[PDB]
C-alpha cells in the first residue's frame, strides 16, 4: 500500500544485497510497505528512472555490464533534488570524513532522510550531520555502521527505552581480533597477514583495521548515541597491533563506552579477558556485545557470522524504521 | 511534556517494580514522557485518583499496610471507565485464561490499551484478544510474558523488520531446567525439591513448570506472534520431568518454534544438545534465545540474571513503545 522511493549511492556488498533484499522485501513483507529504487550509482555510473528495473540493476552489476544501461544519467547533486524519500549511503568511506559532510548536508537540504552504512561523517563529524538534520526537520539512522547487521542502535531505540544505558562492551571490529587470536596462536605476523591476504580477510591497506582506527570510528559513534556527546575521533582512545609481543588466547580488542568521572569515554583497548568472559566465547567471524542498563538488566547479543548481507539488513531495517 | 494515564492491576514482585521504574523514569527520561498513575490494584485493595502518590503506594506495600490509604475504592470495572490511557495487567494467572480474556476485552471497549505481563488470556484465547482489540481499535503489548526482561518482541518488532523469521529456539522456562541440571549433578529428585523449596526457586504448587506447562503457554504466545497463526494451548507439544530416569548435562528442556512442512509449529522438548550449543553456555538463571532470521542472520540474545525487577523494565518498555 504505502510506496518509498529511495536513492541508492553505492553498489559494492552492502549495497548490491541491499537490492536483492529490496526486491525479496517488496515480494514478501506483511507490513504494507513497497520500496522504489529512482536512482543508484556506483563508481562508473549514476542512473536515474521513475521506477529503477532492480532486477536488471543485480544482473548487470553481477556481469559487469553497468555500463550497457540506457537509464538517465545525473551527478547526485542532481539526483538528490528529484522526489523520492530517503537515500542510503553505502558509498566507500572517505579518510576525513568531508564527502559524507557534505553529502548529508545537500540531501537534508533537499529534503530526504538518510540512511548510512558509512562511519566517515559520523565519525568526524557528528554535530555538524545532527545540526544539519534538525536545521531542515530531516533524520538520519546508521544501524549498519557498527556491530554490521547485529541490532545494536535499534535495540538501544526501541528494545531498552526505560533504561539509562550504563554502559556498552563489545568486540565491533573483526580483523584485528582475528590477527590478535592467529598471533595467539603462536604463529607470526607475517604468516598470518600473507594467508589472510589470500583469503580476502584483509585488505591490501591494512592500516585502519590494525592500528584500532576502525575500532575507534565506531567507538565515536557509539559513545555519541548512547550518552548525547558530540564527540569526535580525537576524543575516543584507540590502540592497535602494529611493537613486537606475544598475544595470550584470552585477549581481544574491546570496544568500551560509558560515563566514567561524570564524562561519556569510549575506548577500544588490548585486553586479557577473563575465562568466563562472554566476549570469549564469540568466533572470529562473529560480532557481539554486552549492554549493561540500569533498568533492563545485562543483556548479551551477537550474530554467528558477520557478512555483507547481514549488513544490508540492517540497512533494510533502518528503512522500515524510517518509513513506519 | 507529554503525560501518559496507567492504571496498574498487581502489586507483586513485578508490579511493584514497576511503580519504582515510573518513578525513576519520571525523574530521569530524555524522552518527553511523563506515566502518571490513577489506580494501582492489588488483591485486597483497589484505589482510585487523579494522581496517585506512586511513592506512598511502594511505601505501603512495603510495610504491608495498604489498609491504611485513603483513596478512593471502586471495582475494577467502575476503574476501566475512568480517563486514562493503558491498562497494565500484573496479577496472578488464572488456569483457562477466562477473567484475563474478559478483561481485556472490558478494557478494548472502554478505549485503553493493555500491556500485560499475564500469560493466561494469551495462551488460551489470543485470537479472541486480537479480535476485541481489531474491533475497538485498541492495542496490546506483552514483552513480560515470555523470557521475562529479555528483549524479545520489541526485539522481533523493531530490530529484524526486513526478515520473515525462519525460527526460534530457547529456554524461555529456568524452573524445569533447573531441576534438569540439577538432576545431572547425579542428584535425586526429591532433595532437589527439598532445597528448590527453602531457596524460593519453586513454588508450593510445582505442576505448571515441572510438567512443562509454563514452557508450553509461552510458545503458544511466541507461536503467534512470529507466524500470526491463533494456536491455543492444545496446538502445541509439550513435556515434562515428573518419569524416573537420569539425565545429562547436556539436556535442557528447550522451546522452538518455526515453520515445518507448512505449517507454524511449536514445541517444548528435553534435548540433549550438542557441546558447542549456544543454549548450553546459559546459566541456571539466565533466559536467551536463538532467533534465525532470513535476512538478519541468526541472532543470539540473552540476559545474566533474570527477576522481576528486569521483568517490569519490560513492561516499562511497553509503556514507552505504546506511547510513543
Known sequence: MKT?????????????????????????????????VVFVADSLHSYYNER??????????EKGSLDSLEYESISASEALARDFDIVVDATPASADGKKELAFYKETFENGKDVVTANKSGLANFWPEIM??????????????????????????????????????????????????????NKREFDDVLSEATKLGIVEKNYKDDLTGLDAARKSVILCNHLYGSSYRLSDVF?????????????????????????????????????????????????????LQTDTNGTLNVSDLYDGPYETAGAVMNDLVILSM
Chains 1, 2 share one sequence.
Open 52 to 61: 529503477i528495473d532492480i532486477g536488471k540493476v543485480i544482473s548487470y552489476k
Open 131 to 184: 545540526e544539519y538534520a534538525r536545521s531542515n526537520n530531516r533524520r538520519i539512522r546508521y544501524e549498519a555502521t557498527v556491530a554490521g547487521g547485529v541490532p545494536l542502535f535499534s535495540f538501544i531505540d526501541y528494545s531498552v527505552l526505560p533504561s539509562r544505558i550504563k554502559k556498552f562492551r563489545g568486540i565491533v571490529s573483526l580483523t584485528i581480533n582475528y590477527f590478535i587470536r592467529e598471533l595467539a
Open 4 to 36: 518509498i522511493n529511495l536513492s541508492i549511492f553505492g553498489l559494492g556488498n552492502v549495497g548490491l544485497n541491499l537490492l536483492r533484499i529490496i526486491r525479496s522485501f517488496n515480494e514478501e513483507n506483511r507490513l504494507g510497505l513497497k520500496f522504489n
Open 238 to 290: 584507540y590502540e592497535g597491533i602494529l611493537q613486537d609481543r606475544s598475544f595470550g588466547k584470552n585477549e581481544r580488542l574491546v570496544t568500551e563506552t560509558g560515563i566514567v568521572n561524570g564524562k561519556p569515554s569510549a575506548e577500544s583497548r588490548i585486553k586479557s579477558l577473563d575465562s568466563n568472559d562472554y566476549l570469549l566465547t564469540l568466533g572470529k567471524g562473529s560480532l557481539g556485545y554486552q
